Amino acid sequence: QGRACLSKAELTADLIWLSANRTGEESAEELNYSGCDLSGLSLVGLNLSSVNFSGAVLDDTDLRMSDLSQAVLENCSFKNSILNECNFCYANLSNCIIRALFENSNFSNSNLKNASFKGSSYIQYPPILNEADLTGAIIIPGMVLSGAILGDVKELFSEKSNTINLGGCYIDLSDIQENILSVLDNYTKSNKSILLTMNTSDDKYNHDKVRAAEELIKKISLDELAAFRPYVKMSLADSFSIHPYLNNANIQQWLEPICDDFFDTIMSWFNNSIMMYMENGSLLQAGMYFERHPGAMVSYNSSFIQIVMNGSRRDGMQERFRELYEVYLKNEKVYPVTQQSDFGLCDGSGKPDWDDDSDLAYNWVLLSSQDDGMAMMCSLSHMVDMLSPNTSTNWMSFFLYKDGEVQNTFGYSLSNLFSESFPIFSIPYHKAFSQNFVSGILDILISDNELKERFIEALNSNKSDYKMIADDQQRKLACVWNPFLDGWELNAQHVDMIMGSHVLKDMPLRKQAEILFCLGGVFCKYSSSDMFGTEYDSPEILRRYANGLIEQAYKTDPQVFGSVYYYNDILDRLQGRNNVFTCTAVLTDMLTEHAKESFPEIFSLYYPVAWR
């Protein structure tokens, strides 16, 4: 169409029109563009199925979204081409030199024998090689080999320093920023990962994966693995602590020191927080860390328990984690709890019930974070609930022990038990209890939906354009709040309603006072120049309610103020005697600054995040 010697502009028009009127029954001559130089071109979105670009040159060509299915592309060149989203299905690309961007390029069922991808890359979506023949081909780290035909091994081991044999193909390491670490990170550098490449190859290549792995580890210096390198370490654990590498002594011994150090750091850092999710290889390595270091079962108890809960349920390693847990049950602090009627199987055998579909079995024993002899016995179901609670979470569904003796869980304060003894539950608990706290107060104060919405919406921003200092605005405020005020003090029945709430009544006095202080700060913020007040004045009603809250906080626990002088100072500023106008911007900052200094955790939970 199609002769070797023409201008590229004609080849271009020819091809764009060929594409514009494809018949499907084209002739051998009309389809012939062999040996043609098509470099520098833009053959984008062109229907070129069945075309014969044999031995041609498509360097620097934009082929994106084009259809080259069934094309005869053998012996071609695509140096610095852009192949993104090209269709190469059933295409023939034997011996081709592909140095291209190949994002989502479709080589399904293509012939790629002896081809080379050296220098190619993608950003997020790999090329598709399903049922493509890659025998003798040179591939690169990051390529996904699902369903690819690699060929059987001809040479077991490469002698070229920069290549690793996988089946009958070759992984080239000459374009990896001269840093082997760049190809070992499945999490943040997936598009460059040789671990991805190896593990996406089919099962029949399992013996080649192992060999490839032994060759790979020779290229990794112990120096390079000295740094923390967390994503690399996790990737190695994930990729090599699974079948078929698990039965290879060499690989497993190389992993151990790496994983031991990494998982030690992880277990200690994570202790008393919810545990990260782990792929199988890492989870198994986490388990093996505890096998080697039984002391850590106690030192990092909440990390340990979550790991075991995870592993005891992970298909392929359950038994191994059950045996690990049963070693922990022998610990001196744990044993007494296992000797309870309600433990595990409930038969006094000291054995968990590993076969409870409901996950209601009391299998799990958590030790206190302080030296007070406390332990908790709970079920997997309730533990998961408590770690990620909602409004319906049952917080009392565990048995408590002190020095191995069952306790009445009614003389206790959940707030204190969690914060002092089982911190793993403390943030989740206090977080759940603080949810919609000021919203709940507003629901009680303001029956008028439109006004309530102004208050609730303002929670989400640090500033408001809506103001409430005008006469009619303050009159509206007075009608709403007057039933809740006795002058500058809160009405006694309103107080009882606040102090009696589910959210407050079981908090220690001190925390009750801090929460009330914060609520006092909230209504001072509402009254300030940033919100419903102005640079020069603030709605008196809101100052009164803030004042009542502050006085209530002081009655509840005066020590939250540090001294009576600060308390008095707040009241004076709020009440503003002798003042025609009173601005609350400064006082707002005095209150939040004090909360930040004196009770930052409560402040962070109860004061709206948008406002701090």
Apex 124 CA angle, 121 and 129, nearest 5? 65
Same domain, 316 and 465: no
Cα(483)–Cα(544) distance, integer angstroms: 12
The partner residues of 420 in beta bridges, in order of sequence, read: none
The partner residues of 400 in beta bridges, in order of sequence, read: 376
> Quick one: which of 572, 443, 587, 595 has its CA closest to 515?
595
Angstrom CA distances, 556 to 58, 360, 387, 499, 505, stand at: 81, 40, 30, 10, 12
CB 603 within 8 A of CB 518: yes
Handedness of CA 531, 537, 543, 547 (dihedral sign): positive
φ/ψ region of 260 (left if φ > 0, alpha if ψ in -120 to 50, else beta) reads: alpha
Cα(227)–Cα(238) distance, integer angstroms: 19
Give backbone dihedrals phi and psi of 486, rounded to 5 degrees, phi first: -115, 85
554 sits in which H/E element:
helix 540-556
- Resolution as reported, in Å: 2.1
End-to-end CA distance of the chain: 71
> Quick one: which of 85, 94, 18, 3 has its CA closest to 51?
18
> Quick one: which of 57, 45, 49 has its CA closest to 31?
49
Same domain, 184 and 199: yes
Cα(595)–Cα(262) distance, integer angstroms: 38
CB 498 within 8 A of CB 564: no
Three-class SS of residue 92?
A: strand
Cα(130)–Cα(407) distance, integer angstroms: 62
The 163-166 sheet, strands edge to edge = 138-139, 169-172, 163-166
Cα(173)–Cα(157) distance, integer angstroms: 15
Cα(486)–Cα(497) distance, integer angstroms: 15
The partner residues of 365 in beta bridges, in order of sequence, read: 377
CB 112 within 8 A of CB 133: yes
318 sits in which H/E element:
helix 318-328
Same domain, 250 and 284: yes
**How many other C-beta atoms can be found within 10 angstroms of the C-beta atom of residue 468?**
23
CB 173 within 8 A of CB 162: yes
Q: Which amino acid is at 530?
A: D
Same domain, 365 and 402: yes
DSSP string, 96-152: -EEEEE-TT-B-TT-B-TT-B-TT-B-SSSPPB-TT-B-TT-EE-TT---TT-B---
Same domain, 375 and 478: no
Domain count of the fold of the chain: 4
354, burial (CB in 10 Å: exposed 0-12, middle 13-18, buried 19+):
middle
Q: Where are the beta strands (DSSP E) in 390-548?
A: 399-402, 405-406, 485-486, 489-490
Which of 412, 435, 458 is the C-terminal boundary of a domain? 435
The partner residues of 405 in beta bridges, in order of sequence, read: 402
Cα(366)–Cα(376) distance, integer angstroms: 5
Q: What totals of helices (H) and strands (E) does the chain contain, helices first?
A: 22, 11
DSSP state of 489: E
Cα(173)–Cα(161) distance, integer angstroms: 8
Same domain, 357 and 498: no
Q: Where are the beta strands (DSSP E) in 329-472?
A: 364-367, 374-378, 399-402, 405-406
160 sits in which H/E element:
none
Angstrom CA distances, 512 to 97, 386, 551, 599, stand at: 72, 22, 13, 12
**How many other C-beta atoms can be found within 10 angstroms of the C-beta atom of residue 320?**
15
Q: Which residue has the tokens 């989400």?
A: 460
The partner residues of 53 in beta bridges, in order of sequence, read: none
Q: Which residue has the tokens 């790991």?
A: 307
CATH number assigned to the domain comprising residue 197? 1.25.40.300
Q: How was this structure determined?
A: X-ray
Angstrom CA distances, 302 to 267, 311, 342, stand at: 9, 14, 22
CATH number assigned to the domain comprising residue 146? 2.160.20.80
CATH number assigned to the domain comprising residue 358? 3.40.1850.10
DSSP string, 185-210: -TTT-GGG-HHHHHHTS-GGGHHHHH
Which of 403, 435, 467 is the C-terminal boundary of a domain? 435
* 352: containing domain: 333-435
Same domain, 463 and 584: yes
**How many other C-beta atoms can be found within 10 angstroms of the C-beta atom of residue 510?**
14
Breakpoints of the chain, after residues (C–N > 2.5 Å): none
591 sits in which H/E element:
helix 585-598
Three-class SS of residue 324?
A: helix
Three-class SS of residue 480?
A: helix
Same domain, 440 and 574: yes
Cα(536)–Cα(580) distance, integer angstroms: 10
Which of 123, 147, 177 is the C-terminal boundary of a domain? 177
Apex 220 CA angle, 187 and 286, nearest 5? 50
CATH number assigned to the domain comprising residue 583? 1.10.4140.10
Same domain, 199 and 322: yes
Q: Does the N-terminal peptide bond of residue 244 adopt cis geometry, omega within 30 degrees of 0?
A: yes
Same domain, 156 and 224: no
Same domain, 458 and 369: no
Angstrom CA distances, 555 to 159, 498, 549, 568, stand at: 82, 14, 10, 13
Same domain, 205 and 267: yes
